[PDB]
Design a binder for this molecule. Structure first.
Ligand SMILES: [Mg+2]
Ligand SMILES: [Mg+2]
Ligand SMILES: [Mg+2]
Ligand SMILES: [Mg+2]
Ligand SMILES: [Mg+2]
Ligand SMILES: [Mg+2]
Ligand SMILES: [Mg+2]
Ligand SMILES: [Mg+2]
Ligand SMILES: [Mg+2]
Lengths: 180, 261, 188
RNA sequence: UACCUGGUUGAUCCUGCCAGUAAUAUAUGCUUGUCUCAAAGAUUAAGCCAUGCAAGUCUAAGUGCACACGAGUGAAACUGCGAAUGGCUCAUUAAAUCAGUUAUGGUUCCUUUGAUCACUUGGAUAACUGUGGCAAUUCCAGAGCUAAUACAUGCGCGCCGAGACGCGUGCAUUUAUCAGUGGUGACUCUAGAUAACCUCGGGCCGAUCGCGCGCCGGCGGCGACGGUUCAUUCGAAUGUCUGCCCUAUCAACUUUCGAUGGUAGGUCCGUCGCCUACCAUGGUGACCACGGGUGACGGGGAAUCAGGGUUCGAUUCCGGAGAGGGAGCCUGAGAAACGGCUACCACAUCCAAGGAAGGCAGCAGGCGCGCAAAUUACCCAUUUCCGACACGGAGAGGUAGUGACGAAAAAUAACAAUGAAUUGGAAUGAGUGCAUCCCAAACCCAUGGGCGAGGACCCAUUGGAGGGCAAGUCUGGUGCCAGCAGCCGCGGUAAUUCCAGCUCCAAUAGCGUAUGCUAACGUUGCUGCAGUUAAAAAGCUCGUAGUU
RNA sequence: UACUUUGAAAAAAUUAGAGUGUUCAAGGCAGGGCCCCCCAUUGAAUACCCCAGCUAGGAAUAAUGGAAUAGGACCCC
RNA sequence: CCGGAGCGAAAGCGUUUGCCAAGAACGUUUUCAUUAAUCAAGAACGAAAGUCGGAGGUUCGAAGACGAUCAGAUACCGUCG
RNA sequence: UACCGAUUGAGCGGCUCAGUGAGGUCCUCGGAUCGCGAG
RNA sequence: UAGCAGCCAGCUUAGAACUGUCGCGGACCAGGGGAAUCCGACUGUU
RNA sequence: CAGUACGAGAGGAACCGCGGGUUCAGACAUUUGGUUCGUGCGCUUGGCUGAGGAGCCACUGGCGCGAAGCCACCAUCUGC
């Protein structure tokens, strides 16, 4: 008997067809367009959508005005609008079945810092996040998969210690200044 | 096993104690006392997790051994004392008096009462034993035996007794229309008046309770604790007495409060 | 040792069952007391929970009661005459429950001659009291025959193997007539 | 994601399986830079174990005339209370365990809570002192003392009869009798009374310790501890109803020697064929008894799933069971206890050969067994438990070490001109020390500043490239050889399949293989398969259970 | 009395799921806001838990009983 | 005569006549009023061949003998059986 | 690779008949020894 | 009326206690057994 | 004697002396064992003397122990 929990769940799932050409093209297209490292990040965001769609699909089975459907349905809808993947105009349980994997891939931290003009390309966006350059509301984030919500959208900027923003130069800037 | 157990696992502890998972393997097994193991709250939990006056179990030992805590007027030095329903905890160092009453949900509350209210408590009669020489006795829910009671007190009524004297000052007749509090079974903490008492000979009697907002419910007879005569309570009711706002009603109450905070 | 468990018995269907555990201590049994008739010898044994039981091994005196009247006098036991379980307990003179014994009758005729002032086994205010009692003083003929011999036919209603006392009552009424024909059928 | 593809033929449409495909289990091959979390001698062997450790325990308050000390501080011992909890393993165990349900008005219960109930006696003993035995042990013996919270002693009603006493102080205990204070669906309940009983191996009414001196030999302050009888609480035992896998190549089983029931008793904490004695001849079974098998502990659960299902559950939570194999008992509130004892069996240790002693399916570690599983480490600081206790102890537990069982995050480059080991300046990590933080001390992470990248030599592997199945009519070698290949096949001197070079593909700090398991499989079909000819309807009819 | 609906009752952990920026996530049950405290009753929900047993409604469907050798049901009294 | 005709639960059943019991269908404004359908372990019947005990034994004919045929022929064909 | 096979084939386990039966526990009495009692 | 009273009559069976030196069908009476081969079936006869 | 002579080793003697034994021979009964109809003592089955006591009968009723004799490399002693 130990004071541990031993709870752990996977975040992705491998496809049934290992070498389906029609699948490899659309997954590689998502990798290069959003600057991903491997196919696991594609299968992860697909598994994330599958959990949300399955949760909404269960609520569509329940009839309207149900205390469980009204509570869990409104909680799931407001949670999607919070992260920005769902619009405020039409927040219904049936529009969750019209969500694509690209909607979640646009809320990552590497894609937001690229759209905000702070980074040159999408690949340049991921390399500076891992190098402790950008922050979100005075919080330095080192993870590119940081799902930015709408409340923290206008607070993504460079850190107060990075040379890109306002701070001391890097190790190789002063190194070249000392030698010459 | 070969005898009585002395340990208690933290995951096997009652859920209403609100104990976490990664702090330790064992939970404080409440020592033997007036209240049952599943229906009480140890003194260590009340001072460390509820009041947060002590951060560890050793500090609770130092708090109790200085003779500061006193349950029902008597000073206690056992950190695992089973402080149960309607019990009074007096802290003369800070002038604080607590009475363990359930929440709107099935959990105990840090409910501070005044000094004049801390002088008494409410005890539910369990049995009436006729001792030697025809002397009647009252067995309350906290094992208190009181001799020569009012002959109008019956097997399911409550009495208001003093903590220093130990005698009955008044009592509430268990009948319809009187206020009652549920002490377990998916309705723990709800307060309402009694409407009907179904009698099933040979099994448990289920009564029907209706709160102020009209959300009538039911429970067994062994879970009802009369706390008031009619519609006026004899003890200070906690905030959020027995309404049991649904998960939808609580959500709107929280959102409207965050915007006003 | 001696066990009172039921996991060694066959099931109601008739099939053997296998034991789930060893012999537990809360299932122990102890040998019989076999209370003989002699000088008082009572051994005390500690039982579960720290309590005490009294193993009466030998007994000679017993507090027997009278049914018709109210006369419970500590009297001496002579011998056993009938047992419903088996007649082997009558040979060894074993004192058990619900066994018919021959008890002495001197204190009963002493009380009767001191209460009604009439032979049994052979002031103005005070005389009126006894005359009121003589109106209801007839004894059944089955008892008067026993008082002539000095031996009353009693029945042990106590458990000497548990409490250590061979108490009981005097047989009267239809119960006395039942055990008389049981003994006379054996004596014949 | 409610999915299919190769293979019988010259070709075709089918039944069908073999093969492919994707998770999940252990094991293994190759490979590995950060950070977090975490399983880990279960499978064969409930096999055998060196050594250390794992249960001990003082308050102002049961005893305390050695040390060291101005009474106190501290030891040994006795009296207490614990050691019956925890931990470990899964051998046994198929209405047994267990899970819901429910009863005990068929029971007992240490501790905890509340009720109740002589101004001081007697005799021993340990520690201590001292004489000693044995080859040897938590081995003892002889003698001399002395304490108790040790062990024993002790201060109105019914009868009678001139309406004056005596017995019951009272509660327990046991039996008998009879009038119906307060309860319960329902007492042969709880209380009243009478008659006595009341165990010498006799039930109880404090011959007890504290800090304190305040006053009129006397009354007083506050606490500790102990006992009786009732409550409670932690429970524990024994029952109620329903629910277990495979097997008929197990169809009748049980009953001298208890199987089913009745009666009386014994016994037990209490109920009961639990046992004995006398009677009755029953009890179970085709709705599967009984017997056998289980690589069977049960369940909460786990894996995979469109819906149904299939499989797994030695494993941290609950219950049960057992400490080499069985059996027996002591102490106690609680044990049929084994980190208690006594036997036989197996195994094994020391020995002057007379004897003595042993139980790691506890924590480390060793051996053996195997495809298969880690340090003879640190601390009681957190979590709790035990104890005369705020102070002690705890391999329970916690923290490190080993660790690709697994799960999460996530480097191996980014940005600009010029036609690439070309060039160019920027950017933080890996690593490395130094402070701080962290933590019982340490370690790890995190925060700073000082070093730290140009083949940013600080180099990404693992399987494939005929089809299924994403990817070379390339080049050299071999010539049905060596080898490849899950399947179909390839190699017969011009091999897209072998051995290599180059190139390419897939997933990626992983990946291949072997064996189970799941979906594939509507190839076990309840949902949902088939039986004219591909495997298949008894030769036919009657006939009870069963189903309808 | 099967079915059906409701209620009572039920160990947690696990699963589902509400809230909450451990830098994100697996997870945890904590923590958020203002200048020695106060407010957010700071929070630490809720659902599921087969079958059987218990309880209260419904009376379709499927079984089952009632008067036939009548003294059968009500009265009379 | 003898049929893609009849009957029987199937196997099976073909001269005339008599006897015994049974059966389907049809007819009915008769009667009983659910008595029914299919049915594990059970049971009746069941071609030909084969077995046992008797009677019988015309034809046919396993085995076997012989005559052919053939490379061989213990086969096909033929004569006895 | 299984099968039949004289060899009362051989080995290793489970539950038991009968006999022998260690060691506890109770019951009867037995009194080394100690101050009628404890033993 | 779940039959009782009186009287008479033998011979067997079962169980139990106690007891002698564990001896007890105490003399007498009174099958050794098992696994196989050969021959003849068996009883009978010579 | 001796692990010596001898032998490269591996291996490996003999005389004197000492202590026993094999086979055989001649005896012997203290001891152990066999026998026991001193029919010695106890017990016991069936029957018989009326019973107790004491005894008898069953070609030695049976059983346990057993003196004296005799006896065995089955005990012991001697052998130039
Ligand atoms: Mg032969
Ligand atoms: Mg021969
Ligand atoms: Mg012959
Ligand atoms: Mg040599
Ligand atoms: Mg001799
Ligand atoms: Mg004789
Ligand atoms: Mg003769
Ligand atoms: Mg003879
Ligand atoms: Mg002899």
């Amino acid at each position: 008997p130990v004071a541990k929990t031993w709870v752990c769940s996977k975040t992705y799932v491998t496809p049934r067809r290992p070498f389906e050409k029609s699948r490899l093209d659309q997954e590689l297209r998502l990798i290069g367009e959003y600057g991903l490292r491997n196919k696991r990040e594609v299968w992860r965001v697909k598994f994330t959508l599958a959990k949300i769609r399955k949760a909404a699909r269960e609520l569509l089975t329940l009839d309207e005005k149900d205390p469980k459907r009204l509570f869990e349905g409104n909680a799931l809808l407001r949670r999607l609008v919070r992260i920005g993947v769902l619009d405020e105009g039409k927040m219904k349980l049936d529009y969750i079945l019209g969500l694509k994997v690209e909607d979640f891939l646009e809320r990552r931290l590497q894609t937001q810092v690229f759209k905000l003009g702070l980074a040159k390309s999408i690949h340049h966006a991921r390399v500076l996040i891992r190098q402790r350059h950008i922050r979100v509301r005075k919080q330095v984030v080192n993870i590119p998969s940081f799902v930015v919500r709408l409340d923290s959208q206008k607070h993504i900027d460079f850190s107060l210690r990075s040379p890109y923003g306002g701070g001391r130069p890097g190790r190789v800037k002063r190194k070249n200044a000392k030698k010459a | 096993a070969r005898g009585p157990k002395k340990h208690l696992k933290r995951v096997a502890a009652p859920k209403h104690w609100m104990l976490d998972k990664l702090t330790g393997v064992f939970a404080p097994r409440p020592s033997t006392g007036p209240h049952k193991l599943r229906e009480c709250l140890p003194l260590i939990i009340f001072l460390r997790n509820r009041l947060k006056y002590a951060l560890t179990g050793d500090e609770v030992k130092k708090i109790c051994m200085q003779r500061f805590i006193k349950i029902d007027g008597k000073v206690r030095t056992d950190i695992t004392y089973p402080t149960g329903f309607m019990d009074v905890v007096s802290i003369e160092k800070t002038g604080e008096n607590f009475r363990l009453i359930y929440d709107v949900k099935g959990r105990f509350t840090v409910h501070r009462i005044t000094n004049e209210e801390a002088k008494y408590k409410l005890c539910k009669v369990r049995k009436i034993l006729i001792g030697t020489k025809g002397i009647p006795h009252l067995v309350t829910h906290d094992a208190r035996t009181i001799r020569y009671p009012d002959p109008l007190i019956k097997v399911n009524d409550t009495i208001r007794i003093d903590l220093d004297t130990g005698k009955i000052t008044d009592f509430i007749k268990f009948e319809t229309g009187n206020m009652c509090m549920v002490t377990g079974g998916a309705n723990l903490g709800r307060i309402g008046v009694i409407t009907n008492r179904e009698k099933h000979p040979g099994s448990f009697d289920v009564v029907h309770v209706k709160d102020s907002i009209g959300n009538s419910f039911a429970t067994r007879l062994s879970n009802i604790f009369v706390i008031g005569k009619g519609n006026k309570p004899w003890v200070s009711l906690p905030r959020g007495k027995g309404v049991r706002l649904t998960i939808a009603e609580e959500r709107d109450k929280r959102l409207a409060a965050k915007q006003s905070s | 040792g001696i066990s009172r468990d039921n996991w060694h018995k066959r099931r109601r269907t008739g099939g053997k069952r296998k034991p789930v555990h060893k012999k537990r201590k809360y299932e122990l049994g102890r040998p019989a007391a076999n209370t003989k008739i002699g000088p008082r010898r009572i051994h005390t044994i500690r039982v579960r929970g720290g309590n005490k039981k009294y193993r009466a091994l030998r007994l000679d005196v017993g507090n027997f009661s009278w049914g018709s009247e109210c006369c419970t006098r500590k009297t001496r036991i002579i011998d056993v005459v009938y047992n419903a379980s088996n007649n082997e307990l009558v040979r060894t003179k074993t004192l058990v429950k619900n066994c018919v014994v021959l008890v002495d009758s001197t204190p009963y005729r002493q009380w009767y001659e001191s209460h009604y002032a009439l032979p049994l086994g052979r002031s103005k205010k005070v005389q009126k009291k006894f005359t009121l009692r003589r109106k209801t003083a007839k004894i059944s003929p089955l008892l008067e025959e026993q008082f002539l011999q000095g031996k009353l036919l009693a029945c042990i209603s106590s458990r000497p193997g548990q409490c250590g006392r061979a108490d009981g009552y005097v047989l009267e009424g239809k119960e006395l007539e039942f055990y008389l024909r049981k003994i006379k059928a054996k004596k014949g």
